Design a protein around this nucleic acid. Structure first.
Ligand SMILES: [K+]
Ligand SMILES: [K+]
Ligand SMILES: [K+]
Ligand SMILES: [Mg+2]
Ligand SMILES: [Mg+2]
Ligand SMILES: [Mg+2]
Ligand SMILES: [Mg+2]
Ligand SMILES: [Mg+2]
Ligand SMILES: [Mg+2]
Ligand SMILES: [Mg+2]
Ligand SMILES: [Mg+2]
Ligand SMILES: [Mg+2]
Ligand SMILES: [Mg+2]
Ligand SMILES: [Mg+2]
Ligand SMILES: [Mg+2]
Ligand SMILES: [Mg+2]
Ligand SMILES: [Mg+2]
Ligand SMILES: [Mg+2]
Ligand SMILES: [Mg+2]
Ligand SMILES: [Mg+2]
Ligand SMILES: [Mg+2]
Ligand SMILES: [Mg+2]
Ligand SMILES: [Mg+2]
Ligand SMILES: [Mg+2]
Ligand SMILES: [Mg+2]
Ligand SMILES: [Mg+2]
Lengths: 98, 133, 63, 183, 62, 138
RNA sequence: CGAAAAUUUAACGGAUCUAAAUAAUAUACCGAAACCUUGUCCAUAUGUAACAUUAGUAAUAAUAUUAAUGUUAUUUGAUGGGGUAGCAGAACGUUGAGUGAAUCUUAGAUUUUUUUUUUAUAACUAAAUAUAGAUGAUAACUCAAGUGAGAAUGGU
RNA sequence: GUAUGUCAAAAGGGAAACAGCCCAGAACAAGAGUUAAGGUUCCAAAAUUAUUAUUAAGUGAAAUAAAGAAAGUUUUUAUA
RNA sequence: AUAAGCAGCUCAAGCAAUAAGAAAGCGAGAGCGUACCUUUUGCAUAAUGGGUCACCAAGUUAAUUUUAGAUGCGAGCGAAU
């Protein structure tokens, strides 16, 4: 290819910081919705599914925050910043073992 | 009203005793560092004022002299100073034309802007005596 | 730059560090001697009449 | 506008500063402890501080269009501090548009022909705005190999004590104590 | 609407014709459907028009 | 309780369905705040745009007026003295000084009713050739 | 270390950096025509008041009101604001005509210019130069088009 | 072909330069205003800001060359 | 006359009125900006066209058939006596 899409294979310490704070800000949105409903003795199916199969920023490994799964890579790992709309999309869980 | 601090009650006479004084007035939140006699040209047409109206400015961020500087946390107490301005008139700028155009498109949209500005004149800037307060 | 607003942000100079320490809990007066030449109107105490009460120790000594 | 009304003479005057490439610099050094390990400012870290003075960007009246810079007299450029193996492994290049006329030289070989003063000029030169003031600002960098220079009388003073001298600070504070005896 | 009198009028360069087609260069026949046979041919014309029928002026008692 | 929802990010490149979760909430532009009751139908509407909004639990719902007034900046001035003016709909408002407080607006069909000095007033002022200031004041 | 290509260092942007590299963290600051704030322009609404015009309806010998249109302000502290193909609405300007047997002009009509002001594809102020009483110019409203050109290897 | 978006018809900030990527949808101004992506020694607006480790090769620092070799070095887990 | 600008725009020193008053213009220096149109998925493109300026130069007219709005009459309308 001759068209240059200069995208470094790894993120900088500044992109990682904002990524951590974005993953942490989405945790507060769900915690606020989960606690506000508990006061009324109510639950939403989506909130239950999120709190069940999605971890918090303090429970995620560094490799789950900054990389994703890509079968076309030699080690099945790919920079999370290579995902479309990675900043405003939720990606936290990868296949087991990879 | 909240009593003035004891540290400000002892140094204010020294602040007002010096030759010159300046203040940072805040009109609608925007600061303006002015002195008695300056001419402020606000970037907006103050509604409801005619040339000759006297205004009392009550939001001052800093009122200091050469060496001393009085600073209020959000603002300074109005009882310490007295700043007044007078509306001198309204001024306008020359018409500016902005041409919004794209490459390989003949349509050129024009935008004509000619804004008015209110001009003030700081005719009073004095520090009060708070020996009684 | 393209507009006057951008030119102003690039040519910015922050205020003196003394003003950055904005107070809290109320108002205060701080000693801020500028690094500039004083005018001929800051009469030295040696040229003040013996009657002038404004004569007083250095404001630095009041702090 | 009042802030700018006055005598701007001394704000635009050229000040002659001085710095030694061998004196330890607690601020421009990467080592801060122990105090006996504090090194001088490295080549690039010294050039970044000098380029700021040549531009006058340290003045509250700075303007990129106005040449409000100052002079910087650098001494002891022979003992210029460098880390790693930059002295023998770094290379400087040159080309005069003629294919085959590529001139290369290392830092240790460049310090033998034009001394360490040329190594510091190329560093400061690249840190200045690429415009018509680059040659005037760079020309105000007085770099010398040893302790001698023709500007020992130009260096800024405060009470007869050159800035950076043993007792220049106490000479400054003594002059400001007298300036408070006035209204 | 005076077409072809500038871009800011909204009917300027192409005058509302598109870009280099038959509808811009020439004219398409009104009965043309691109080549597909019309229904009048696929189905045919049904009936006849009576040319001998009288035409009465209808009058109501109302 | 209510959900104070504020659109922190945009959805330009997000799918159309995301755009219509934001329309159901009322978030048209960026940094726009809306109030919705704490209910499942609204909680599930936020789980779809949780990467774009900032949620907060508030006791009551704020009116449109109060929300604007949070960001309003102190005027910083007070008109204490107003010169004579002409209100096109009411009439001539005489000079008023709020420092000693009286905005009286006189309307009529004759110069006298307006409350201004007319030509006749200037003639009687010029005929009083006897009035003289007190010697003590002179 | 493996790691070699033909104009020149040659994919750190460059200077340079032993961190100003790398990895795991924390905070501040900068940062767009985004957002907020204070003003302005425009579009579309909603009510109210006042000004002018046109046409009606009443009063008046000792002015009020109704409707339409234009306009300013104001109420909801109203809402809205990139754009090709393309669709739609509202206007300006040019040429000629009607009102016009009208209006204005040596107390300066008209002068391809210059200048000034006004939200302004336009007109206006003033200046300089020259000198016309109508085969001169002209507001407003309306009518009709040989009516608006940096683009056709266009034509003269 | 399919799903989603952008460009096409979208300027602006970031990616050195950039139709399609990351942010964000330009009615006009003012503001050390508040932020996004991105960044903060100098060119160049903002940290030479703090903490714990690694690297000595300018490796690297905004486009990862491979298998492989080896008393390079650090750490861990066994062990003398 | 030390400099690598689609020549504009943002910031702007200085010069410029013999005189009371009155600063248009030119602009050192700093920064931003790779003409226009056509045609294309996409053009600073080394794709098309133009040496410059002025003038001529392209949805018009008729008949017929329709629509919207306004308006006349109205189970009649129109035309003509
Ligand atoms: K390198
Ligand atoms: K040609
Ligand atoms: K024509
Ligand atoms: Mg290429
Ligand atoms: Mg169009
Ligand atoms: Mg069409
Ligand atoms: Mg049509
Ligand atoms: Mg064509
Ligand atoms: Mg077609
Ligand atoms: Mg779109
Ligand atoms: Mg290089
Ligand atoms: Mg906006
Ligand atoms: Mg918009
Ligand atoms: Mg539009
Ligand atoms: Mg003339
Ligand atoms: Mg031609
Ligand atoms: Mg196309
Ligand atoms: Mg774009
Ligand atoms: Mg960079
Ligand atoms: Mg700031
Ligand atoms: Mg800086
Ligand atoms: Mg020269
Ligand atoms: Mg060409
Ligand atoms: Mg002709
Ligand atoms: Mg013609
Ligand atoms: Mg229509």
């Amino acid at each position: 290819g001759g068209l240059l899409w200069k995208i470094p294979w790894r993120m900088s310490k500044f992109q990682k910081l904002r990524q951590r704070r974005r993953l942490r800000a989405v945790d507060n949105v769900v915690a606020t919705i989960e606690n506000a409903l508990a006061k009324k003795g109510e639950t939403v199916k989506a909130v239950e599914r999120w709190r069940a199969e999605m971890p918090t920023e303090a429970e995620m490994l560094p490799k789950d925050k900054y990389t994703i799964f890509d079968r076309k890579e030699k080690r099945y790992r790919k920079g999370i910043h290579k995902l479309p709309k990675w900043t405003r999309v939720s990606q936290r869980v990868n296949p087991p073992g990879y | 009203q909240p009593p003035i601090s004891q540290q400000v009650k002892e140094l204010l006479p020294v602040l007002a005793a010096q030759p010159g004084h300046y203040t940072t007035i805040h009109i609608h939140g925007k600061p303006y560092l002015v002195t008695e006699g300056d001419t402020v040209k606000l970037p907006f047409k103050m509604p409801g004022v005619a040339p000759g109206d006297v205004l009392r400015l009550n939001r001052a961020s800093v009122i200091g002299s050469r060496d001393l500087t009085l600073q209020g946390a959000p603002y300074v107490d109005e009882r310490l100073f007295e700043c007044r301005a007078i509306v001198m008139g309204t001024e306008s700028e020359p018409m500016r034309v902005m041409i919004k155009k794209k490459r390989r498109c003949r349509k050129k949209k024009h935008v004509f802007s000619k804004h008015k500005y209110t001009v003030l004149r700081i005719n009073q800037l004095k520090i009060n005596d708070v020996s009684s307060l | 730059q393209s507009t006057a607003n951008r030119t102003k942000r690039m040519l910015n100079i922050p205020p003196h560090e003394s003003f950055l320490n904005v107070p809290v809990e109320g108002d205060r007066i701080i000693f801020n001697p500028p690094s500039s030449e004083a005018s001929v109107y800051h009469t030295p105490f040696k040229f003040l009449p013996r009657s002038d009460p404004r004569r007083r120790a250095n404001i630095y000594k009041l702090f | 506008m009042s802030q700018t009304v006055g005598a701007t003479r001394l704000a635009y005057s050229r000040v002659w500063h001085h710095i030694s490439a061998v004196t330890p610099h607690p601020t421009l050094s990467t080592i801060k402890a122990p105090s006996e390990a504090i090194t001088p400012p490295s080549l690039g870290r010294l050039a970044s501080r000098i380029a700021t003075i040549l531009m006058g960007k340290h003045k509250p009246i700075w303007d990129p269009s106005t040449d409000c810079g100052d002079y910087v007299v650098v001494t002891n450029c022979a003992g210029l501090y460098t880390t790693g193996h930059k002295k023998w492994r770094k290379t400087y290049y040159r080309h005069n548009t003629r294919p085959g006329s590529l001139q290369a030289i290392t830092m240790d070989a460049l310090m033998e022909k034009h001394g360490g003063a040329e190594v510091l000029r190329k560093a400061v030169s690249g840190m200045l705005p690429k415009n018509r003031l680059r040659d005037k600002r760079l020309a105000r960098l007085k770099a010398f190999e040893g302790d001698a220079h023709p500007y020992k009388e130009n260096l800024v003073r405060f009470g007869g004590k050159v800035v950076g001298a043993p007792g220049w600070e106490e000479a400054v504070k003594a002059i400001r104590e007298a300036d408070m005896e006035r209204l | 609407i005076r077409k072809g009198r500038g871009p800011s009028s909204g009917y300027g360069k192409t005058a509302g014709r598109g870009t280099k087609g038959q509808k811009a260069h020439g004219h398409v026949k009104p009965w043309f459907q691109g080549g597909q046979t019309p229904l009048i041919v696929s189905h045919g014309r049904k009936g006849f028009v009576n040319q001998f029928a009288a035409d009465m002026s209808e009058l109501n008692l109302e | 309780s209510f959900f104070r929802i504020t659109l922190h990010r945009s959805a330009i490149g997000l799918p159309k369905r995301t755009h219509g979760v934001l329309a159901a909430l009322g978030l048209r532009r960026r940094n726009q705040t809306v109030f919705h009751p704490v209910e499942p139908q609204f909680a599930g509407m936020l789980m779809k745009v949780k990467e774009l909004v900032r949620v907060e639990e508030v006791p009551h719902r704020l009116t449109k007026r109060e929300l604007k007034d949070e960001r309003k900046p102190d005027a910083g001035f007070v008109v204490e003295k107003q010169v004579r003016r002409f209100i096109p709909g009411v009439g001539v408002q005489d000079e008023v000084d709020f420092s000693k407080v009286g905005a009286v607006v006189r309307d009529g069909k004759r110069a006298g009713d307006l409350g201004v000095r007319t030509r006749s007033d200037w003639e009687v002022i010029g005929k009083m050739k006897s009035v003289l200031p007190k010697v003590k004041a002179l």
